[PDB]
Each structure stands twice: as C-alpha cells, then as structure tokens.
Amino acid sequence: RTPRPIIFLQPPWTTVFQGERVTLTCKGFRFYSPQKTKWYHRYLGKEILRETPDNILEVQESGEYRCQAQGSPLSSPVHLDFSSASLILQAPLSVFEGDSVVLRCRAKAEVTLNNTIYKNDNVLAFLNKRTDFHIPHACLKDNGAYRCTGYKESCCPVSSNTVKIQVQEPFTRPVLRASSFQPISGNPVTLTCETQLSLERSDVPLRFRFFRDDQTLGLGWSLSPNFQITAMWSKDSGFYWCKAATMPYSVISDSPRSWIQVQI
Amino acid sequence: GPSVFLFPPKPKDTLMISRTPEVTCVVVDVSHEDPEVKFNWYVDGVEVHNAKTKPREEQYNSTYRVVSVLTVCHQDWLNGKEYKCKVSNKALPAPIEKTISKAKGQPREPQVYTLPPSRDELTKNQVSLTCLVKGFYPSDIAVEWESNGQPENNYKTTPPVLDSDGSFFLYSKLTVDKSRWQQGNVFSCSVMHEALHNHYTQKSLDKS
Amino acid sequence: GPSVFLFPPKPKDTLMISRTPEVTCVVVDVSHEDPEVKFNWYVDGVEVHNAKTKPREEQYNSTYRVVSVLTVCHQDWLNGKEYKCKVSNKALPAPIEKTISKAKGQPREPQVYTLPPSRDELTKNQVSLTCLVKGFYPSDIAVEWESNGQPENNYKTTPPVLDSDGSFFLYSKLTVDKSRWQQGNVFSCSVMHEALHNHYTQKSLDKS
Amino acid sequence: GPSVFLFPPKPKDTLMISRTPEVTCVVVDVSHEDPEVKFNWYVDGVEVHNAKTKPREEQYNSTYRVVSVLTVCHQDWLNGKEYKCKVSNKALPAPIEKTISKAKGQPREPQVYTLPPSRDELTKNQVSLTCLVKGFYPSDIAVEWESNGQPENNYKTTPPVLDSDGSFFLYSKLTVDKSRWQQGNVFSCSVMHEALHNHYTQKSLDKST
Amino acid sequence: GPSVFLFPPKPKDTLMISRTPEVTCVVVDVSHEDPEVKFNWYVDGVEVHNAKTKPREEQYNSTYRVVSVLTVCHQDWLNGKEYKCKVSNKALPAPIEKTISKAKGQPREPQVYTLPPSRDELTKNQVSLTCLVKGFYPSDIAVEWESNGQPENNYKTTPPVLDSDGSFFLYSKLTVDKSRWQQGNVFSCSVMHEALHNHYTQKSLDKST
Ligand SMILES: *[C@@H]1O[C@H](CO[C@@H]2O[C@@H](C)[C@@H](O)[C@@H](O)[C@@H]2O)[C@@H](O[C@@H]2O[C@H](CO)[C@@H](O[C@@H]3O[C@H](CO[C@H]4O[C@H](CO)[C@@H](O)[C@H](O)[C@@H]4O[C@@H]4O[C@H](CO)[C@@H](O)[C@H](O)[C@H]4NC(C)=O)[C@@H](O)[C@H](O)[C@@H]3O)[C@H](O)[C@H]2NC(C)=O)[C@H](O)[C@H]1NC(C)=O
Ligand SMILES: *[C@@H]1O[C@H](CO)[C@@H](O[C@@H]2O[C@H](CO)[C@@H](O[C@@H]3O[C@H](CO[C@H]4O[C@H](CO)[C@@H](O)[C@H](O)[C@@H]4O[C@@H]4O[C@H](CO)[C@@H](O)[C@H](O)[C@H]4NC(C)=O)[C@@H](O)[C@H](O)[C@@H]3O)[C@H](O)[C@H]2NC(C)=O)[C@H](O)[C@H]1NC(C)=O
Ligand SMILES: *[C@@H]1O[C@H](CO)[C@@H](O)[C@H](O)[C@H]1NC(C)=O
C-alpha cells in the first residue's frame, strides 16, 4: 500500500544557509536499494533527474526533492530550503514522539541578540544570547508553526522563516488481538500486540508488555509481540491489554483493554 | 470447459468504511491441458486493471481453481455499478461474461431496540445483553457491539429471519461478565444497514 | 431410479406426550412402470407391522412419491432405538436402507430468560416480546408462545446459533399490539427441550 | 499569471460510505485571451481520467474561474494518498502543480459528551442542546444531530479549537423547540472521526439525563 | 509593492478597563531601497501623535514590515470612531489610506448559560465545564472564567459562530481537576459584551448545577 522510501537529511535541518551542503539519504529498509536511485528534483516547473550510484545525494540548492528506488514508488516530498536571509529557524524534517527537537535560531555568521521562539504567532520561549531551542520530549502539544525573531546589532530586528513542527507517532496505537477471546479452559490462546511501525523508525525494536486486568504477565518486557499462554483457567478472565514501547522506554502507548472471557 | 461462478462481497465489507469490500470470482473445473486463465473486469463497461489473480490450487477431482478478486470501494458498489467478470479460456469456445451488481429493491430502515438482561440472569455469572434489529429490508446487514468505543468480542448474531410483513429481523446476544454489567458500563449495539441515515445506528444500553 | 430418504420426527413431537412422533421414510423419483414401493420398518432390528403407508402422488418430474409414516413411542425414540426403512422397488437391484435415530450428543439444559420490550418499542404500535433460550444442546428444540393458557401463532424463532462455549442459543419474537401488551395480559415462552426437567420449561412475562 | 488553488475534501464526505468525497482544484485570474485550460489528474503518480470538469464561470473582475472535480473513495484518501492537479494554459509560462493529501499525525479518539440545556433555557421558547467533542486529532470531523433516526438541520457546529493537549475540541449546538424537549424525545449527537471505531459515535441525550 | 492592513483591537482589550485596546497599522513588502514609512494616525478627522510606531522588521523573505500601534480609549472605539492610518512610501504615488471602525449593527444582549459536565465525564481525571454564550451581536466578546474572585487560566473559547437568527454564539470550555469539582467549588463564567448591562454578566456554576 505504502512502499514509499524515506529521505533522511544530514544535518536534519530542512532549512539551511546558502554556502552549506546537506546529504539526502534514500533510506530503504524493506525493498532495500544500495544504489540506482532516481532523484526527482523539482524547483520551479522542473523535473530534473540526477541518478547517483550510491544512496546519498549531496545537494546545495533549494527546492523539493524525492527519490525512487528500484521497484519502489516515488518518495515523499522533502522541501529543502537554502536561504540567504539574515536569520532562519532550522527545524528537523520529521518529528516523532520522544525526540529531542532542536529548533535552532541561527543567523548568517552573526550573533543575533534577543532571540524569541514564537509558537502559533505568540511568544513561547526566550533565548537570551542563545540559539538552540530544546523540546526534551516531543508530543502533540508541540505542534504548530514556530518562528524565531531577533534584534541585529543595529540594523534590523529580523523574523525567521516559519517551520511547521508536526509530530507523528513512531508506531500506531497497539491493539491486542488474540487467537480467540473465548478460549475453552485448557486451550493455548496467543496474545498479539501488533503495532504498524512507521517506515521512518523501523530499525528500532519494540518491547511489548502484556497485562491482565491489572497484573503484568511474563517477566517485564520482551521483544516478541506474541505472549503465549499454555492454558488459561476461569480465574484469569479479565481485561487484557498490552503496552508497546521503544528501546529507551521513552514513549509508551497503551492498547485498548479488550476483555477476554473463558468458556467452561 | 471450466465453470464460472461469481460471489458478491459480504454485506459487512460493503457496509463498514474501515473494511475493504472484495468481490470474488471463482473459476473451477479448470483442465490441466489449458490451465492459463486470463481475467478481465468491467466497471459499467469501462475496462479496469485493479483486479489481482490468486495462484491456482489443485482440487480433489484433478482440476484447478483460480480466483480473481477486484478491489472495489463502497460508493461504486452501493449505487449499483455493473461489474462484469469475463473469463478467458482456450478450452471454452467463447469467454464467459456474466453481470453482477447490488440487488436492487426498496430499502426499509432497521428499528434497533436494545434490551437489558432478564432479572433471572442477574444472579448468573454472565449476563446476556440483547440487540433486537427488526423491520429491515434487505438482509445485507452488519451488527456489532461496543463498550467505551472498543468492539466487544463475545457477541453472536442470529441469521436474518424473515418477518411476517416481508421485512427481516435478528438479534445479537453479547455475553458480558455480571461484574462489568453491575458497574453501569455502557454497551452499545452498532447496526450498519443500507437503509439507515448514515448507514449506522448505535443504541447504547447501561444498567439504567 | 427412486431415491430413499429418512427424516427424524419433529422436536416437539417426541418431547411432549400429548403429540404423536412420526418417522417419515420418503421415497422420491418412483418410476411409473414400477410404482410398488415395499416398506418395512425395523425397531432395533425387530420387524413391526403397525406402520401406515400413504397413497402415491404425482410429481413435477413425471415420477411418483410414496411416503411411509410409523408411529413411534417417545421412550422408544429418546432412549436410542435404531430405526430402519427397508425400501425395495422393481427398479432397484438391491434394497436401499436408510437409518435415523436420536442425536447421541451430551444434553445441556437450556436457560430460558424472557425479556420485556424496550421502552423505545413502546412508542410503536406493536411491541415485540422476546424470549432468549440460551445454553442448550443439541439444536433439537421447540419454542411456543401461549397467553392465558392458550397458544397463539404470531411469533418467529431464530435458528439455533452456536454459542461461544459450544452450546446453542436462539430467540423468539412475538409481535402483539401495544394496547394489548399494556392491558395487563401475561405471555409465556414455552420451551420443549430434551435436557430440561420433564422436557418442558415455561417462563412468563408481563408489564412488571 | 493565473493562480491555482487546491482544496481538500471536506471531513464529512471522507468518512460516510453514503457520501461522495471530491477534491477540487480551481484556477483564478484566467485571461480571456486564453480561455482553454487542460486538466490532468494524478493520483499516486498515475494518471486518472475519472474527473469531470465543470463549465467555466464568469467573474466580476473580467476574469474566468474553472473548477475541476475528481471523485475518490474514502479508503484511498484515509491512507494518505497524494493528489496532484495539472493545469495547462497558453498564457501560463509553465504548468502549475499543487499537492494535497490527508494531514499526517497521531489519531486520537474524540470523547463525545452531550450536555443538557441549562436551567435558564427552560424559560425560553427554544432550548439549545450541546455536544462537546473533545480530544481528537486531526481537525477532520463531522458532527450531526438526529432524533428518532431522522436528521436534524437546526444545529450549528463551531470550528475545531486547539486545546492544551494539542488535540482539538468542538461544540455543536442544536436548537429545538422546548415542547419537543420537555416530552420524551431522544436527540443523539452523531460524531464521525477517523480515529473512532467504525468512524462513528452516537451519544444519546434526553430529558432524563 | 507595499501593502497595509488595519487590525481592530481584540474584543478582550476593548472592553476591560484593566487592559488597553490598540489599533495596529501593519505594512509589508517594504524593499531595502525604499524603507522609510511614516504613519499619519487619525482618530476621527484630526491627527493625533499618540501612536507608537515600532521599528522596521526584516522578514525572512527580505521584505520589511513596519507596525505602528496606536493605543485608543474604549469610550471612543465603542462609540464607532473611525480610526485610519495614512502610510507614506516611495513606491505608491500617493499615500495609502486604510479605514476601519467598530462593527456597525444593532447590539443584542448575550444569554450566558453555564452547563455542568456530563456524567460520563465525571469519571475522568479532569472535568470540563461549559459556558454557552448565545445570541449576541456583534462578534466582539470576551469570556473569562473565575473561581473565587481569582481568574482561572485553563479555558479555551471557540470563535463566534453565526446562528440562524443572525446573531452569534460560542462555547468557553474550562478544564479543572475533578477533585476541585467534587468539593462544590463555584466557577462563574464572566462575559463582557457591549450589549450587556454594564458590559458584564457572571453565571455561577457549581457541583449542584
Ligand atoms: C514576506 O513576508 C511577510 C511576513 O510573512 C511572514 O513571513 C513569511 C516568510 C511567511 O512565513 C509568512 O507566513 C509569515 O506571516 C508577508 O506578510 C504577510 O502578508 C500577508 C498578505 O500580504 C498578510 O496577510 C493579510 O493580513 C491578514 C492576516 O494577518 C493576520 O494573521 C496573520 C496569520 O494569518 C498574522 O501573521 C498577522 O500578523 C495578522 O495577525 C494580526 O496581527 C495584528 C498585529 O498585532 C493583531 O493586532 C491582530 O489581532 C492579529 N490577528 C490575528 C488573526 O491574530 C488578513 O487580512 C489576510 O490574510 C491578509 O492576506 C500577512 O499578515 C503578512 N504577515 C505578517 C506577519 O505581516 C509578505 O506577504 C511576504 N512577502 C511576499 C512577497 O509574499
Ligand atoms: C477576481 O475576483 C475573484 C473572485 O472569484 C478572485 O478570486 C479569489 O482570489 C482569492 C485570493 O486568492 C481567493 O481567496 C483565497 O481562497 C482560498 C479559500 O477559498 C475558499 O473560500 C473562498 C471564499 O471566496 C471560495 O471562493 C473558495 O471556493 C473556498 O471556499 C471553500 O473552500 C473549501 C476548502 O477550504 C472547499 O472545500 C469548498 O468547496 C469551497 N467552497 C466553494 C463554494 O467553492 C484560500 O487560499 C485563501 O484563504 C483565500 O481566501 C478566493 O477564493 C478567489 N475566489 C474564488 C476562487 O472564487 C480574484 O483574485 C480576483 N482578481 C483580482 C486580480 O483581484
Ligand atoms: C532585549 O531584551 C531585553 C530583555 O528582555 C530588553 O530589556 C531589551 O529592551 C531588548 N532590547 C531591544 C533592543 O529590544
């Protein structure tokens, strides 16, 4: 349905300066492509094709980029931006939960005074002699249009570009499937905590913890998304659910509690 | 000469937007001399290529069965788009073309009433909530159960029984633990029928 | 040639001593040239001569149909007596014998619960009294509806649906007038199943 | 140079199987010297000819406006499929392309609460039933009202408003006659969001609640 | 080609005496070669130098933006005084004049109704009270909540929505802890509008409705 390769910025700032260069990596985990990537660069009524024998594409021009792996559809647009302006707000291309978003209020080789990050056209934070804004844990509250403003030496208070920080879920909210929600007593019923991991974050393993009504099952977390119960009796017929977590246990999503009944 | 059969999509698939309705064309009794079958599908006479062909599987009578399924979405199936399953075979002197569409007829709106469990069952270990759905035509219906926005999985729906006045009626018994019922939890009955307002009707029922 | 078929007696026929259970061994496709269908009935391999043979009838496919009905005892049926129809015809090189008997599954007692109509249905002109007969095995059951000791025929009973635990459950919707329902009349859901006490359980419901 | 604006399908049309979701790309400031505009529709990179182009409309400022409607089905739109509208004109130095798709982000199940009218509204001739719909993402929701299975057209719905959590919240005011409220009548708030189970929730509200 | 925009004072600052209303004259598209803009601020017909022109601000697109904010008294804005700014720039042959004033229409008194949380929401950690403000005109209103004479800053107000009567309505939802709600705390929804008596109306709302 969605075999779209993802382009990864390096540095992750989608907006950079004129002399700087960024490397665009057409990362394909499933349906991998170490080479032969057809880049559909487009700036202004352009369909420029620049094929490279590697997975990287070092560029220094603005526009909208995408890559096309072998046997794979076109990639999502990447709105690169190279600015000659005196102040820009560098933001990561993709923001996921649990990330450390660093919205840099970086000027063009100048120490801009009185920086102030505006979220949704109102003051959010103040950076006195500082540039790097920091969100320690990105969530849905950290959505909107950010834009930093700062006084120059004596020329002009300069407003930077607007970057839309949209936070996407690293994995879909888990749903606890089971082999049967009404297992006869003495039958093995396998729990399943499926989470459709986003293709941006697919190399990160997931740890699943399966629960009874309020008592955890097994020994903490486990990389296996299937918790097999050899034989469940009538006692343990309660609200079963699961918790899907990333490898640092930073962002944890709780599955809806599906009731499992035991038939006898 | 292999035989051609057609199966319409199930009502649940065509009545829930969360699911994808799939129309299944089944070709059986395929001779091993000419097992290659080419499938063509029509949407109001306009050729389409969204159909995918499943791998053939041998039958017990030394024949082959190949099934072609066309991806359809609900709006085109509901208004009555004519779908033609043309089966091309060399053994058959001519290809077999047959016409399928939604069964045309007057729709009657279901009257969803949800009934609390009998007081005789309140002393049992498991109450049985009920969802009578009567007076609906045709029988293409889907009934589900919900609790706090999540589907219950211990419900069984009786087949649609023809009523006296030519309509249909059925039930939906959800077996809920008596403890959950006695804390005032809300259990809703979801009915997805063509004749409804938005093809949906959700009638909740609590301890009240 | 002729075909031999054997059918069990009706579920209400055997469980009530007031009704007469009958086993029908129906023979179809009887040739006109050889219409003499010989009927012999064996009760656990013991020949009996109390059976009744109906006259033949003309069929739509230019054949004949001869039916033999044998009156059986309820004790002689539910205890597990193997019945046999010996069908011999001049078109049949050998006699074709069909066998029927009581289903040997383990009985499970039904739990009859009677549900009053919902408050939503009261706004309608005809309420629908429902009777849930759940947790019964096998499917050989009969449900009636008697008001003030007199059975009435306006109800519809859903086919027995398999429950989650392997038993069966059904429903019976009786549509009575709203004014008649709230006039104070009492209605009963009579259940005739083999696993009950005396093969009978009747539950009443009213406005209260 | 003429401009092209692309408009996503309304949230109502993308969630009901009984509704046709359409996406429109209109063009403004069309010069009368070149009144011929060729429309090419692309869905996920492949050309689709299902679109029907409406006739041109005359404007007040001596320009022309052309609207092209292409009808999709909801499973394609809800999966995040891209949509590109191609406009070709003689006066245009280059064709203008715009891309629209469903806004990405974490879904959140709205919590539908129906609030009965205040005690100070029963002195009025008409009561104002309320359906608070809080905690959903994105702001693609359709909220309706219905009594006894029939639609109600006397409701006005506020636009989604961002809460503190970042999820939106919405309000729906249905104005009904006080006679129809003081009796036994059940008005249900029909909430359709992409995050709810079966994309639907129906919260009943009557005098007893 | 510089352009100017006149923005009316936000309705919250034009009604409370505590805060001050300010009519802003913002210019944009001011190139480097012609960056000098002088604002001639007029109250009704005369020129008043009470304005405080903020310095030029260089946007990201290398075009400047000069904002001249003139503070005004509520007694003049609420009486429909026509504020205008004359922007002088080297691009336009003549100075550009933009004129705005109060929304002129028959004022209608809002009907504030406070709605307690639904019983379904009385199970969550935080309940959300509601303040339906109905049937006012114009859409220049301020809604602020209070608990014990001290303001509560956990509310979000929907923008005014046009009704069938021609008036407006909005809902102000304030979220508080259920612990505070169950003790019987009083939450009064203060509403400031020009049509109300003394431009104020509080509707108290506690656990006993
Ligand atoms: C060059 O950039 C400037 C500045 O634009 C900013 O930076 C660029 C790079 C982008 O990121 C922009 O998105 C970003 O805004 C552009 O100037 C903009 O020009 C347009 C049209 O010329 C103006 O829109 C028009 O004005 C209003 C809407 O303006 C209100 O709402 C905006 C958000 O939608 C705010 O940003 C505005 O400040 C304004 O908000 C009001 O502000 C006053 C002042 O305090 C308050 O008193 C009001 O209460 C407040 N109102 C609200 C709703 O909060 C509208 O009539 C209509 O949409 C007009 O199109 C933009 O206002 C203007 N932006 C700014 C910040 O001034 C230039 O157009 C760019 N040059 C080129 C060549 O494109
Ligand atoms: C000569 O006069 C014409 C008048 O047609 C002017 O065209 C107008 O240009 C302006 C400026 O670019 C443009 O305003 C932007 O439009 C977008 C939003 O559009 C929606 O609102 C306008 C209201 O006028 C409707 O016309 C649109 O169709 C949109 O309304 C609804 O939009 C939703 C999605 O949001 C869509 O689903 C609905 O179908 C649609 N409703 C209908 C009935 O179609 C935004 O980009 C932006 O916010 C601006 O408002 C305006 O739309 C143009 N008018 C049109 C297309 O009719 C010319 O500019 C003018 N020429 C000169 C030189 O002055
Ligand atoms: C910079 O910020 C400081 C601290 O808020 C403030 O006092 C000062 O006036 C600002 N300087 C300018 C030039 O705006």
The CATH number assigned to the domain holding A127 equals: 2.60.40.10
Identity of residue C14: T
Which helix (H) or strand (E) element contains residue B170? Answer: strand B168-170
Q: Does A187 touch chain E (CB under 8 A)?
A: no
Cis peptide leading into D160, omega within 30 of 0? no
Query: Do residues A26 and A75 touch, judged by C-beta distance below 8 A?
Result: yes
φ/ψ (deg, to 5) at B120 = -65, -30
SS (H, E, C) chain D: CCEEEEECCCCCCCCCCCCCCEEEEEEEEECCCCCCCEEEEEECCEEECCCEECCCEECCCCCEEEEEEEECCHHHHHCCCCEEEEEECCCCCCCEEEEECCCCCCCECCEEEEECCCHHHCCCCEEEEEEEEEEEECCCEEEEEEECCEEECCEEECCCEECCCCCEEEEEEEEEEHHHHHCCCCEEEEEEECCCHHHCEEEEECCCC
How far are the Cα atoms of A9, A166, B99, D88 from residue A63, in angstroms, in the given order? 14, 20, 50, 22
Q: How many residues does chain E have?
A: 209
> Token match 């009156």: residue?
C71
What burial letters (b/e) apply to A171-184, b meaning 16+ CB within 10 Å?
Answer: bebbbbbbeebbbe
Q: How far is the C-alpha of A54 from the C-alpha of C180, rounded, in Å?
A: 84
CATH dotted code for E111-203: 2.60.40.10
Query: SS3 for E184?
Result: coil
User: Domain E3-100, what fold?
Assistant: Immunoglobulin-like (2.60.40)
Maximum alpha-carbon separation in chain B: 68
CA distance E135 to E162: 9
Round to whole Å and give the CA distance between E148 and E142.
19
Given A168, A199, A223, the domain boundary residue is A168
The rounded distance, in Å, linking the Cα atoms of E56 and E67 is 7
CA Rg value for chain D? 22
Rounded to whole angstroms, the Cα distance separating B185 from B152 reads 12
Both structure tokens of B8: 């319409």
Q: Please indicate, yes or no, whether residues A151 and A183 belong to a single structural domain of this protein.
A: no
Dihedrals phi, psi of C122, to nearest 5 degrees: -65, -30
Q: How far apart are CA D197 and CA B11, in angstroms?
A: 18
Q: Reduce the secondary structure of E52-121 to three states and give it as a string.
A: EECCCEECCCCCEECEEEEECCHHHHCCCCCEEEEEECCCCCCCEEEEECCCCCCCECCEEEEECCCCCH
Residue A64 lies in a domain: yes
Counting every residue written for chain A, the total comes to 264
- In total, chain C counts a number of residues equal to 208
What's the token pair of residue E97? 């004049």
Residues in chain E closer than 8 A to A83 (CB atoms): 60
| Residues A228, A196 within the same domain | yes
Q: Which of D45, D99, D164 sits opposite A141 (nearest CB)?
A: D164
Take residue D197 and report the two structure tokens written for it.
């189970």
Out of A168, A191, A218, pick the residue that ends a domain.
Answer: A168
| Experimental technique | cryo-EM
Task: Determine contact: A156 vs chain E, CB below 8 A.
Answer: yes
Which residues' Cβ are closer than 6 Å to ligand 3?
Answer: A 114, 151
Compute the Cα dihedral for B54, B56, B59, B61 and give only its sign. Answer: positive
Q: Where are the beta strands (DSSP E) in B22-110?
A: 22-30, 38-43, 46-48, 52-53, 57-58, 64-71, 83-88, 99-100
One-letter identity of residue E28? V
Q: In what order do the strands lie in the sheet with E96-100?
A: E38-42, E83-88, E96-100
Domain that holds residue A206: 175-259
C-alpha of residue A114 to centroid of ligand 3, in Å: 6
Strand order in the sheet with A189-194: A175-178, A189-194, A226-229
Phi and psi dihedrals of A178, rounded to 5? -145, 160
- Write the single-letter amino acid at A144: G
Question: Could you tell me how many residues make up chain D?
Answer: 209
Quote the CA–CA distance of B185 and B145 in Å, as a whole number. 13
Helix (H) or strand (E) holding E182: helix E178-182
Question: By the 8 A CB rule, do A180 and A157 touch?
Answer: no
State whether the Cα torsion E7-E12-E16-E19 is positive or negative: negative
Running DSSP on this structure, what letter comes out for residue B75?
Answer: H
Give A237→chain C minimum CA distance, Å: 14
E199 secondary structure, DSSP code: G
Closest CA to C68 of C10, C6, C26: C26
- How far apart CA E75 and CA C161 sit, in angstroms, is 77
Amino acid found at B129: L
DSSP tag of B79:
T
Peptide bond into B138 cis (omega under 30): yes
Rounded distance, CA C38 to CA D1, Å?
A: 97
3-state SS, residue A186: coil
Q: Which two tokens stand for residue D135?
A: 């905690």
Rounded CA gap, B207 and B14, in Å?
33
- SS3 for chain C, per residue? CCEEEEECCCHHHHHCCCCCCEEEEEEEEECCCCCCCEEEEEECCEEECCCEECCCEECCCCCEEEEEEEECCHHHHHCCCCEEEEEECCCCCCCEEEEECCCCCCCECCEEEEECCCHHHHCCCEEEEEEEEEEEECCCEEEEEEECCEECCCEEECCCEECCCCCEEECEEEEEEHHHHCCCCCEEEEEEECCCHHHCEEEEECCC
Q: Which residue has the tokens 């097999």?
A: A228
Q: Nearest by CB to D18, which of B151, B188, B198?
A: B198
Contacts of B208 by beta carbon, 8 Å cutoff, 6+ apart: B184
Pair C153, C102: CB distance under 8 Å: no
Cα–Cα distance measured from residue E32 to residue B63, given in angstroms and rounded to the nearest whole number? 82
Touch criterion met for D and E (3+ Cβ pairs within 8 Å): yes
Question: Of E4, E5, E19, which is best to mutate to test ligand 1, by the most ligand atoms within 8 angstroms of its C-beta?
Answer: E5
Decide if A80 is inside a domain.
yes
CA angle C20, C22, C27 (to 5 degrees): 155
Q: Which residues of C touch B115 (CB under 8 A)?
A: 115-118, 130
Helix (H) or strand (E) run with residue A146 in it = strand A144-151
DSSP string, B89-133: -SSSSS-B--EE-------B--EEEEEPPPGGGTTSSEEEEEEEE
Nearest CA-CA partner of A159 in C191, B75, E54, B199: E54
Per the CB < 8 A criterion, the answer to whether D94 and A45 are in contact is yes
Instruction: Answer yes or no: do A160 and E58 touch at CB < 8 A.
Output: no
Instruction: Classify the C-alpha dihedral B86-B88-B89-B92 as positive or negative.
Output: positive
How far does the centroid of ligand 1 lie from the alpha carbon of residue E80, in Å? 25
Q: State which of D12, D27, D28 you would mutate to test the pocket of ligand 2, scoring each by most atoms of that ligand within 8 A of its C-beta.
A: D28
- DSSP letter assigned to residue E165: T
* Residue B169 neighbours by CB under 8 Å, 6+ apart: B132, B133, B134, B135, B136, B160, B161, B163, C156, C173
Q: For residues E121 and D111, is the Cβ–Cβ distance under 8 A?
A: yes
Question: Which residue do the tokens 């057809």 mark?
Answer: A38
Q: What is the largest CA-CA distance in chain D?
A: 67
Give yes or no: residues A179 and A118 share one domain. Answer: no
Contacts of D176 (CB under 8 A, 6+ apart): D126, D127, D129, D147, D152, D154, D187
3-class DSSP assignment, residue A8? strand
Ligand 1 contacts (CB < 6 A) are A 121, 161-162; E 3, 5, 7, 10, 24, 26, 28-29, 59-61, 63, 65
Q: Which among D73, D144, D197 is the nearest to B73, CB-wise? A: D73
- How far apart, in whole angstroms, are the C-alpha atoms of residue E80 and residue E83? 9
| Nearest beta carbon to residue E115 from set D115, D161, D169 | D115
d(Cα A223, Cα A217) in Å, to the nearest integer? 14
Output the CA–CA distances (angstroms, integers) from residue A150 to A111, B179, E27, in the order listed.
10, 62, 19
If you ran DSSP here, which 8-state letter would residue A129 be given?
T
Same-domain pairing of A89 and A217: no
Of all ligands present, the nearest one to the C-alpha of E159 is 1
Whether the bond into A11 is cis, omega within 30 of 0: yes
Distance CA A67, CA A62 (A): 16
**Does one domain contain both A159 and A247?**
no
Residue nearest to atom 25 of ligand 1 (CA): E5
Instruction: Report the separation in Å between the CA atom of D4 and the middle of ligand 2, taken as the mean of its atom positions.
Output: 10
Q: Do D161 and E164 touch (CB under 8 A)?
A: no
- CA separation for the pair C125, C129 (Å, rounded): 13
Which listed ligand is nearest to A115 at the C-alpha?
Answer: 3
Instruction: For chain C, say whether A182 makes contact (Cβ under 8 Å).
Output: yes
Amino acid at residue number B203: K
Helix (H) or strand (E) holding E22: strand E22-28
Residues 6+ apart with CB under 8 A from E87: E2, E4, E25, E27, E37, E38, E39, E40, E95, E96, E97, E98
Please, are residues D9 and D44 in contact by the beta-carbon 8 Å criterion? no
Q: Which residues pair with C68 in a beta bridge?
A: C25, C53
Per-residue tokens: A107: 């000027």
Domains B3-100 and B111-205 fall in the same CATH topology? yes
- Is any Cβ of chain A less than 8 angstroms from the Cβ of B125? no
Q: Whose CA is nearest to atom 11 of ligand 3?
A: A114
Measure the CA–CA gap between C59 and D160, rounded to whole angstroms.
71
The one-letter amino acid at C68: S
Query: Closest-CA residue in chain D for A172?
Result: D106
Residues C160 and C141: their CA atoms lie apart, in Å, by 9
Interface test with A, best of B148, B150, B176 (most A CBs within 10 A): B150
Chain B residues close to D71, C-beta within 8 Å: 75
Nearest 10 degrees: Cα torsion D39, D40, D42, D47: 150
Residue E36 contacts A, CB cutoff 8 Å: no
Answer yes or no: do D202 and B192 touch at CB < 8 A.
Answer: no
Contacts of residue A172, Cβ cutoff 8 Å, sequence gap at least 6: A195, A196, A197
The full set of domain ranges for chain D reads 3-100, 111-205
Number of structural domains in chain A: 2
E56: nearest CA in chain A? A156
Q: Chain E closest CA to A188's CA: distance in Å? A: 36
The DSSP letter of residue A74 is B
- The distance of Cα D50 from the centroid of its chain, to the nearest Å, equals 22
The architecture in CATH of the region C111-205 reads Sandwich (2.60)
Whether the CB-CB separation of B15 and B140 falls below 8 Å is answered with: yes
Q: How many Cβ atoms from other residues are within 10 Å of residue C182's Cβ?
A: 14
Asked if residue B106 lies in contact with residue B136, where contact means CB atoms within 8 angstroms, the answer is no
For residue B9, the SS3 value is coil
| Alpha-carbon distance values, D107 to A21, A135, A258, D137, D142 (Å) | 35, 21, 19, 5, 15
Strands A78-83 and A15-17: parallel
Q: In which residue are the tokens 């001869």 written?
A: C66
CB within 8 A of C161, min separation 6: which ones? B156, B157, B158, B159, C168, C169, C170
Cα of B64 vs its chain's centroid, Å = 27
N residues, chain B? 208
* Closest CA relative to residue D202, chosen from B154, B160, B199: B199
Q: Do B115 and C114 touch (CB under 8 A)?
A: no
Q: Report the C-alpha dihedral over residues A21, A26, A27, A28, rounded to 10 degrees.
A: 180
Residue B131: HSE in the Cβ half-sphere, 13 Å Cα cutoff: 27
Residue D27 CA to ligand 2 center (angstroms) comes to 9
The answer, for E59 touching chain A at a CB cutoff of 8 Å, is yes
- D137, with CB counted inside 10 A (0-12, 13-18, 19+), is buried
Q: How much distance in Å is there from the Cα of E68 to the middle of ligand 3? A: 19
Residue B51, C-beta contacts closer than 8 angstroms, at least 6 positions apart? B39, B41, B68, B69, B70, B71
Produce one character per residue of B69-98: b if its CB has 16 or more CB atoms within 10 Å, e if not.
bbebbbbbbbeebebbbbbebeebeeeeee
- Our answer on whether C and E touch (3+ beta-carbon pairs < 8 Å) is no
Residue A87 corresponds to which amino acid? L
Residue B19 is classified by DSSP as S
- Best residue among E19, E26, E68, E69 to mutate for probing ligand 1's pocket (most ligand atoms within 8 Å of CB) is E26
Whether the Cβ atoms of residue B82 and residue B48 lie closer than 8 Å to each other: no
A to B CB pairs, distance under 8 Å: 20
The D-side interface with B (CB below 8 A) comprises: 15-20, 71, 73-76, 109, 144, 146, 149-151, 190, 192, 196-204
State whether residue B66 is helix, strand or coil: strand
Task: Give which of D79, D202, D203, D205 to mutate to test B binding, by max B Cβ within 10 Å.
Answer: D202
